[model samples]
Target: AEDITLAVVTKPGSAQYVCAERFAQLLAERSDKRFNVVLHHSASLGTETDILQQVQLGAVQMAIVTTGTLDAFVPEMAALDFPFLFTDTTTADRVLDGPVGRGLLDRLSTAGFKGLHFSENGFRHLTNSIRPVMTPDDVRGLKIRVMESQVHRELWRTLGANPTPMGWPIYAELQQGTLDGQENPLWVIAEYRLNEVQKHLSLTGHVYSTHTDLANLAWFEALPANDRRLLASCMQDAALWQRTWSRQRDAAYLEQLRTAGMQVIERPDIATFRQRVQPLSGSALFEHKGVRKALEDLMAATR
Candidate 1:
C-alpha cells in the first residue's frame, strides 16, 4: 500500500537503471498487490554519491549505485574496485556469488546499508582521443578522466596517466581537448556515444565494476523475517537478470563502436597492465585494516 522508493543515477536504458527497474518490478509482483515502488531516475534522484547519502540518511529506501563511490563510506568496497581484480565474466560471477563478495556486502551494514546483491557494471575498458594504448607506457602523459574514487585515480596515476576525478557526462572536456580519454563499460560508450569523441578504444578490462543493490540498513532489518527474505530473493533474482542482460549486449556494443569508426583494440597487453599496478598490492590505499583484508581475500579467491 506504500511506495518503496528506488533511485538510480543514470537515466533509463542504463545498467544501473535496468537493474533498479527490474528490482522494482520483481519486488512489486512478489509482494502481491500490497506494495508499490517509485522508480526515481534522471532528475528525480541525484548523483551516485548523492543517492548513497540519501539511502544512508533514510530519505531514500533503496538504490543501485557503482561500487567506486562506495569506498568513501566503507573502505572495504574499495578493495573490490582494485584494477584487474577480475579477469573475465565467468571468474567474476564465481567470486561475487561466493563468500568473499558476501563479506564485502556485510561491511555495508556499518555504512547504514543492507547490501542485498551485486549486479553487473561489466568490465571497464579504456578509450581516448590520442593514439591507441597498448601498455602502461602508452598511457603515460595522457589526460584521463577517472571516476571520483580513490582507487580509480591511483590506478590510472600508477599506470602513468594523468587522472582527473570528475563527475559524469565528461564529453565536454573530451570534446574541448581539456581531457584526453576516459574509462567505462561498453554500454557506457554506446549509451553516451563516447565513440564520437574518443578515437581509441582498448579492451583493457582494467576493473570489473559492480552495481551494489542495497537498502537502508535500519529499514531492512526492521522488516518482518518473511519480508526481508522476499526482498533479498527479489534483488538477487534481479541482479542475475541484469548480469545476463549486460553480458548479452556487450558484443553488439563493441560492433556499434567499430561501426562509428572508433579504432578498437580487442586485446591489449593485459599482462603489462596487471604488472604495473601490482605495487598497489602494498599501496597505502589498502593499508587500512578492513581494506587490505578484503583485497587479499578477493585476490585469493580468484586464484
Candidate 2:
C-alpha cells in the first residue's frame, strides 16, 4: 500500500506546533511508517484564519489552532473563550476532556471540520511597555490587542480598556509601536521576544487558552474505520502529552522572563477583575444554546 501523508498546520514553535509534531512522531512509529503526519510550521501553510479555511476546503488535512480563531467559523466555540473560566491546568484538563468538551468538539461537524482533541497554549497573561497593570483601572484607555473572539473583546471592554481584535502575529505591532501591549502565555511572550519590546508583565491568568486538533470532515470520514480510530487515539494521546509539557514549561518560562529583565507583577487583584467581567459569564453568552447550565456545572465541579 502507498504511504499516506497528512499535513498539520500551526505557528512555528508554538505549544500547538510541539503537540502536532509529537503526534506526527507517534503516528509514524505506531503505523509502521504507513501513515505520515507532515508538519507545516510558521504559518507556512497560512495564518490561523487562512489555514482554518483551507482545512474546511480540504486544501489542508489538519491543523491545531487556538479556539478563539475557531470562533469565526463556529460561534458556539467562543463559550470556551470566556475570561476566567478555568482556574488552572488540571481543572482545564478535566473539563475539556469531559462531556462538555467532547460535545463542543462534535459541533464542528456542521462546519466541515472534524475536531480530534484538545491541546493548550496555557493561561494567558498581560504585558505592555506603557505601564504596570495592577488593577482594573490600570487597563483603562490603554489599547490592548486580543484574539479575534467576541467574548475577549467584551471582557476587556468591561474591564475598561479599548480592546482591538488582532491576529496572532502581533510581535511586529508591539515592536513598531502600532499597539501598546498584548496578552499571551509566558511561552508565547518569551518565545516571541515580547520582553524586548514590552517591559511589564502581569500574571493576570485571565484565560486558559485551548487549542483544537482539527481535520477536514469529509476527508476524515472517508478514511477506513481502523485508520480513523488510530488517528483519533494518537491525537488524544499527543494532546495529553502536550498539555503536561506546557504546564511545566509555563513555570520555567515565567522565571526566564523575569531573568530577561521583564518586571513581573506576581498578582494583579484578580478578584476585582473577575467581578468586572462577571457580566459576560456563561449565563450571559451561552444561555441560547442551553449550554449555560452545563458550563456552570463544569465550573462548579472543577472549582
Candidate 3:
C-alpha cells in the first residue's frame, strides 16, 4: 500500500504558502517518494483558529500559522509579538533560530501540536485611507483592525488608535469603509490588494510577525524515527529559505505599492513610537512575568 499523504495548511500568496510549499517539495524528495504532501491555501479549510483546532484533534496533519493566532492557544507566543522587541530581521532570525526560539516552539507539545520551525511574516506596518501616520498622535481616533490578541489591542490603544481585534478575512470591511485602516506587512498589503482601498502605508515595523509550522502531535509521533527526523530537518531548511524570501519580497512589494499609488510613509517616528509603548513592557496589565522575562531576554540578546 502507498504511504498516506500529509496535508499542510497556510494562507495563500504569502510567506506561509512559500514555506509550506517548500516543505512539501523537500519532504517528498528526501523521503524517496515514500511520503507525499498536499497544501490547502487561503483559509480553504478554515480560519487559522479553526485550522489549529483541527490539527489538535488530528483532523489535519500539518499547518503553518501566524503567531498572533497562536496567542489564544499558547499565550507565551504573544510575548514575541511585543512591539519593537526586535530591532530588525537579522536580530529576530538570530533569536528565533537560537535557544530562545526553540524554547517557545517546545511549548506547543503541551497543546498537542508539534512545532517544526518558525517562518517569517515580516515586520507589520499600518495602512489606512485616512492620513499618513508619522507620529503616535496620528493614530488617534483611527479605527484600525488588529489580530485577536489583547497585547495587540493594548499596543494600538497606547498609540492612540481604536483597535478592533478581527480575523484575517478583513478585505470586505476595508472596502466598505467600515474600517479606517489596518496593519500588516507590505507583502500582505500587496497580496491582499489592500492598497486599492487603503491609500496610506506606514513602515512602522512595529512587530516582528512569525508563522509557526506545526503538525498534529499524535500523527507526528506515530511516524518512524527516520521519517520524523527527515520532517524536522526539512522544515528547518524550508523555514530559513522562506524567511529570506519573505524579506527580499517585502522590499520589492513596498516599491510596488508605491508605484500602485499608495502614499508611503517610509520612515515613521519609530523612536517616539517605541517610547510610547516601552512602559508596557513591564506593566502587569499587559505582560505576565514569564512572558516579560522571555521578551527581556530576547531584547537583550538582540542588543
Best by TM-score: 1
Tell me the tens digit of each residue's lDDT in model 2 across 240-272: 888888777877898999999999999899998
Cα lDDT listed for each candidate: 0.89, 0.82, 0.83
Query: Worst lDDT window (10 residues) for model 3?
Result: 1-10
Error of 3 at 235 (Å): 0.7
Query: How do the residues 17-92 of candidate 1 rate in per-residue lDDT, one tens digit apiece?
Result: 8988888888889999566788887755657888889999999999988888888888789998998888788888
- Quote each prediction's TM-score: 0.97, 0.93, 0.94
Evaluate model 2: give its TM-score: 0.93
Q: Would you list the rank order by TM-score, best first?
A: 1, 3, 2
How many clashes (backbone N, Cα, C below 3 Å) per candidate?
1, 0, 0
TM-score of 3: 0.94
Clashing pairs in 1: 1-34
Task: Order candidates by lDDT, high to low.
Answer: 1, 3, 2
The best candidate by lDDT is 1
